[PDB]
């Protein structure tokens, strides 16, 4: 098959730059073009520019020009995209794709998994796990606020797994340059505070495995 | 240049139906249109190319058409596997442009959200911060407006929301909303409210607590 393995996630400080890879396999690297598409998780896809491996030619999207640079190396079938003077606006996942000719034009027939680029000054920091107990009825919801960590991901489970049904762990959101997420579990009134309910949040990046117990009150 | 408007952001349907996703160019593209299907997992793959007719080794039940500015991907005999986001792309002029994309979801019967509000934790307050959290769980349709009130009036700074994708067992959505304040601002007020407007009732679903009754 045709394959495109892109680089690993990237973490960088605004003002700085980065260089991602796109290694091609299973086809003649120089017989096809590589395009770059950005997907900020806002609203769609943007065409950055592109390049002809054999040709060395490059064509940019006016917007991404000036801060973007596409290159290639052919003694190892790899293409590179370099972003400069990064900003919050450059946080997105970037894809590379192959271009095939047909009719009088192109289209992308194969893509890479994509490369996540988070522009930030944070450093690995463990989250604070706050227990969410109700406030002063046959089913009761309890929460757990995982606040102030970096970088993703975070693993949350309740009672180490034994509490599986009725659990909603939400996508993390960036606030303060740090991620924050929440999780909720719904157990009958007979289990809590009668028994113990604990959220277990793991954060591989900082080698942290926190177990927070949800106790009555505040 | 030519920009594509996929004019429906989220499209709703049942397994088995005939789904039609549209896309309009702000100018004639002489049939230089392509369709991609991105999955929740993040990966993108091609479907149909050129004028919308041409196949790239895929299920026959994927078909394309259109002719000037108006095109469409039609998934007859829809399937689970097919639940994903579809983007159209024009290859007539530079720069290349895609549409906003259209995301399919499974059709389910309406369900009001269950709502829960939670005061700041002791643990957190001792750190000088204060976050009030509100979950709105297992609701459908997925459109919803959460509104916070402090001491009776709206508040909008600090509010950060998160939404889960449609669930796999049931086809409901869940949402979390969090109001973050400093410890002092929080202790300067009494009542906190989480109001959920959803077209399940014309009346909001209200949850709140007072720091005094705490």
């Amino acid at each position: 098959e045709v394959q495109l393995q892109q680089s690993g996630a990237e973490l960088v400080r605004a003002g700085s730059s980065v260089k991602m890879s796109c290694k091609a396999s299973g086809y003649t690297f120089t017989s096809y073009g590589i395009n770059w598409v950005k997907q900020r998780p806002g609203q769609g896809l943007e065409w950055i520019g592109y390049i002809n491996p054999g040709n060395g030619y490059t064509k940019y999207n006016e917007k991404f020009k000036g801060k973007t640079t596409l290159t290639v190396d052919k003694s190892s079938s790899t293409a590179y995209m370099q972003l400069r003077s990064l900003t919050s606006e450059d946080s997105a996942v970037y894809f590379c794709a192959r271009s095939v000719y047909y009719g009088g034009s192109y289209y992308f027939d194969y893509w890479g998994q994509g490369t996540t680029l988070t522009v930030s000054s944070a450093k690995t920091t463990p989250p604070s796990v706050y227990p969410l107990a109700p406030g002063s009825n046959s089913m009761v919801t309890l929460g757990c606020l995982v606040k102030g960590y970096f970088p993703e991901p975070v693993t949350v489970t309740w009672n180490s797994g034994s509490l599986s049904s009725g659990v909603h762990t939400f996508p993390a959101v960036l606030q303060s340059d740090l991620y924050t997420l929440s999780s909720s579990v719904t157990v009958p009134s007979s289990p809590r505070p009668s028994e113990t309910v604990t959220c277990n949040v793991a954060h591989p990046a900082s080698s942290t495995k926190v177990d927070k117990k949800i106790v009555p009150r505040d | 240049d030519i920009q594509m408007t996929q004019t429906t952001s989220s499209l709703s349907a049942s397994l088995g139906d005939r789904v039609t996703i549209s896309c309009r160019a702000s100018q004639d593209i002489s049939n230089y249109l392509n369709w991609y299907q991105q999955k929740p997992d993040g990966t993108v793959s091609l479907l149909i190319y050129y004028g919308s007719r041409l196949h790239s080794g895929v299920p026959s039940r994927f078909s394309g058409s259109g002719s000037g500015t108006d095109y469409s991907l039609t998934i007859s005999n829809l399937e689970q596997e097919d639940i994903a986001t579809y983007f159209c792309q024009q290859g007539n002029t530079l720069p290349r442009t895609f549409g906003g994309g259209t995301k399919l979801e499974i059709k389910r019967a309406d369900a009001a959200p269950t709502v829960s509000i939670f005061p700041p934790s002791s643990e957190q307050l001792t750190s000088g911060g204060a976050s009030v959290v509100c979950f709105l769980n297992n609701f459908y349709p997925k459109d919803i407006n959460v509104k916070w009130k402090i001491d009776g009036s709206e508040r909008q700074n600090g509010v950060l929301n998160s939404w889960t994708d449609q669930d796999s067992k049931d086809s409901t959505y869940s949402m979390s909303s969090t109001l973050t304040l400093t410890k002092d601002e929080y202790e300067r007020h009494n009542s906190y409210t989480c109001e959920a407007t959803h077209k399940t009732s014309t009346s909001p679903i209200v949850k709140s607590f007072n720091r005094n009754e705490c």
């Binding site: 064509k59 034009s105 | 530079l94």
Partner: peptide, 8 residues
């Protein structure tokens, strides 16, 4: 006015 590869 300037080069491309399917268009302007």
């Amino acid at each position: 006015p300037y080069p491309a590869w399917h268009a302007p």
